[PDB]
């Protein structure tokens with residue numbers, strides 16, 4: 037568009053400047069050249085202004101790209117949905133023509149399956165909560181998995197702790213909590 | 224944006240008049256956007272069809288007070304993201320663009336202050 | 342100093358997301374229904390289709406924004422019939438069957454607060470019902486599924502456990518919740534109502550998205566009010582010049598008017614172009630404040646509201662979006678003497694995750710943000726070395742659980 041604006045007329049009798057200077061010597065060449073100069077100058081100013089605004093856009097995007105390359109690549113961002121959709125593992129940058137491209141590796145849980153649960157467990161009066169994990173039941177027995185992977189294992193005292201008495205927790209469930217120390221006592 | 228009784232099947236949208244597009248009654252993830260929830264697309268003997276866009280398949284999560292779902296499997300998914308970082312470094316000279324080897328124009332341009340240096 | 346009690350607070354944040362679309366014809370504005378302004382305007386070059394190309398770019402991005410903000414979910418979840426969520430009732434942010442346009446008791450008092458010359462006003466791509474349905478899907482997917490409807494499919498989890506496993510992020514344990522469920526529930530209910538009161542009483546908060554419609558109507562007013570200005574010519578009414586001066590005097594007069602009107606229109610387009618950059622800057626902040634605060638649990642400080650952020654709910658608003666950050670601000674304090682390490686039988690028992698504190702005679706090992714003092718055992722402390730290098734070491738006794746068991 038900036039180039040094409042040169043062929044325009046703007047009110048003079050011609051657009052090509054030499055021909056104007058090749059037909060009209062003393063003042064009237066100048067009265068036409070005034071119009072030519074005004075028009076061309078305004079077109080140039082407009083072009084410069086949108087260039088400035090577009091450059092601001094690009095710089096905002098480039099700062100975003102710099103942040104992504106600093107956080108996704110070198111470390112391991114916990115900011116959800118920042119570096120990909122799911123749980124972030126790694127990333128591998130790739131060049132691109134006037135840009136950069138990332139390759140977000142991501143863990144994605146699937147193949148769900150539902151169990152009845154329980155916030156805690158009474159046993160001999162004291163309500164046991166899980167250290168890390170959740171309580172579940174496979175229909176008849178109660179286990180303690182982790183969050184994102186059904187890897188059940190026997191409830192014990194090395195993975196559950198004690199707080200108070202099961203009178204205020206709402207939704208308590210009876211069970212027995214296994215002590216590894218008891219079997220190894222007859223020596 | 225014209226009540227299209229006043230124009231030279233024929234659908235009457237909230238954003239104007241859409242002539243030459245069938246108003247189907249089902250809903251899809253839309254291809255070509257128009258406005259006010261109306262999109263158009265090419266599908267099935269073929270023709271063009273306009274409708275109201277959809278947002279997604281319904282899902283009623285069976286929420287109970289003592290039930291939790293725990294995944295049994297994972298699946299590593301690798302995706303892509305593209306971002307611009309720079310644009311070409313273009314520079315323009317004022318005097319060549321405005322006058323162009325035409326000193327009798329540069330003398331006049333002199334009077335206009337300093338609309339080259341900035 | 343270690344807190345004894347806590348308070349739950351439900352603040353508010355308001356951001357603008359998108360302007361109102363517009364599109365201005367060139368020659369209907371410059372030359373209002375005239376033909377003697379065809380010759381006198383084809384002279385100037387590609388001005389018209391520059392102005393008619395910047396405006397559509399703005400118009401399309403102003404609608405890309407509202408689709409990048411609210412359309413981060415993939416499916417439309419719905420709650421079960423009424424409610425069961427422990428003691429928390431979201432009975433006044435959730436949609437209701439009444440009021441045909443599905444909309445909740447808060448984003449209704451938000452909509453009841455901000456109540457042609459060559460100018461056209463195009464409609465938005467997403468009507469006010471579709472945004473309200475997105476903000477209800479994102480609301481029914483977090484009340485029922487927690488962290489994990491942004492990762493993949495939505496996994497159910499009872500709400501009590503959701504709120505309990507959200508504390509374990511900010512630092513406090515889960516017993517702290519389960520023995521204080523009633524307190525936290527009735528603190529949360531009697532903190533949502535203050536938002537209703539504050540929003541209904543005055544328009545104090547919704548200024549951020551009101552001084553935007555109050556600024557896009559100043560430029561749009563000046564643009565049409567500068568049609569009545571001679572700009573340095575005999576008249577401003579086009580037909581009057583067209584009639585009074587037939588010879589090539591109308592050329593110079595109409596050139597003066599055309600230059601004036603073209604300059605005014607160009608300086609309107611430039612102002613819109615600049616003003617549409619900060620709107621996108623705020624729309625890009627809404628997207629990353631709604632990915633992180635809503636669909637997760639941010640550990641950044643002061644980002645999702647002051648305090649320890651643990652939940653949040655989105656609520657729509659006219660050309661905007663409103664959050665309802667929930668935080669965990671501790672309360673009434675005490676003061677205790679402390680020690681960097683105990684010293685039992687030559688070694689130095691550091692605390693696993695906590696702080697040793699005292700009362701004058703006893704010692705304990707508590708958390709950070711609550712005061713539940715256990716008893717120092719070799720299940721709360723890990724031994725490292727000897728008892729001289731540490732500065733501030735104290736000497737005490739450290740209980741061992743297996744010892745009072747061998748006797749029987």
Ligand SMILES: *[C@@H]1O[C@H](CO)[C@@H](O[C@@H]2O[C@H](CO)[C@@H](O)[C@H](O)[C@H]2NC(C)=O)[C@H](O)[C@H]1NC(C)=O
Nearest residue numbers: 172173174175176177178179180187188189190
């Ligand atoms: C899941 O529940 C099933 C019952 O439906 C358990 O099956 C029995 O578990 C007992 C444990 O004391 C075993 O002695 C039995 O041999 C099991 N049954 C069979 C047919 O082998 C099962 O153990 C539970 N899951 C786990 C991991 O224990």
Ligand SMILES: *[C@@H]1O[C@H](CO)[C@@H](O[C@@H]2O[C@H](CO)[C@@H](O)[C@H](O)[C@H]2NC(C)=O)[C@H](O)[C@H]1NC(C)=O
Nearest residue numbers: 157158159160161202203207208209210211212
């Ligand atoms: C879990 O088991 C305990 C003990 O087996 C039950 O405690 C009962 O409590 C009531 C009132 O405190 C007593 O009258 C009973 O004698 C206790 N024992 C039994 C076997 O009932 C407790 O009720 C059980 N949990 C539930 C939900 O019933």
Ligand SMILES: *[C@@H]1O[C@H](CO)[C@@H](O[C@@H]2O[C@H](CO)[C@@H](O)[C@H](O)[C@H]2NC(C)=O)[C@H](O)[C@H]1NC(C)=O
Nearest residue numbers: 205206207208286287288289290425427499501
């Ligand atoms: C979880 O939901 C079930 C719904 O079945 C609740 O079960 C109800 O319990 C009350 C009182 O115990 C009974 O009067 C109802 O008859 C039960 N429902 C049915 C369909 O029989 C259960 O109470 C809920 N969990 C908690 C902790 O209240």
Ligand SMILES: *[C@@H]1O[C@H](CO)[C@@H](O[C@@H]2O[C@H](CO)[C@@H](O)[C@H](O)[C@H]2NC(C)=O)[C@H](O)[C@H]1NC(C)=O
Nearest residue numbers: 145146147148185186187294295296297298299
């Ligand atoms: C988790 O998903 C993978 C698929 O990615 C399952 O792998 C399949 O396992 C079955 C059973 O051994 C094989 O017959 C298939 O050939 C495997 N397919 C692939 C593509 O690996 C894996 O078994 C799943 N895990 C569980 C516990 O079911």
Ligand SMILES: *[C@@H]1O[C@H](CO)[C@@H](O)[C@H](O)[C@H]1NC(C)=O
Nearest residue numbers: 149150151152175284285290
């Ligand atoms: C798991 O969910 C399905 C429906 O989503 C339900 O029919 C089934 O009974 C649930 N399983 C258990 C053990 O509750």
Ligand SMILES: *[C@@H]1O[C@H](CO)[C@@H](O)[C@H](O)[C@H]1NC(C)=O
Nearest residue numbers: 225226227228229235236237
């Ligand atoms: C268009 O004009 C007719 C004439 O009365 C009217 O009946 C119709 O409702 C108008 N269209 C719309 C969309 O209002």
Ligand SMILES: *[C@@H]1O[C@H](CO)[C@@H](O)[C@H](O)[C@H]1NC(C)=O
Nearest residue numbers: 245246247248249273274275
């Ligand atoms: C869709 O079908 C229903 C059923 O008759 C009708 O009421 C409605 O007007 C139809 N909509 C369109 C766009 O054809």
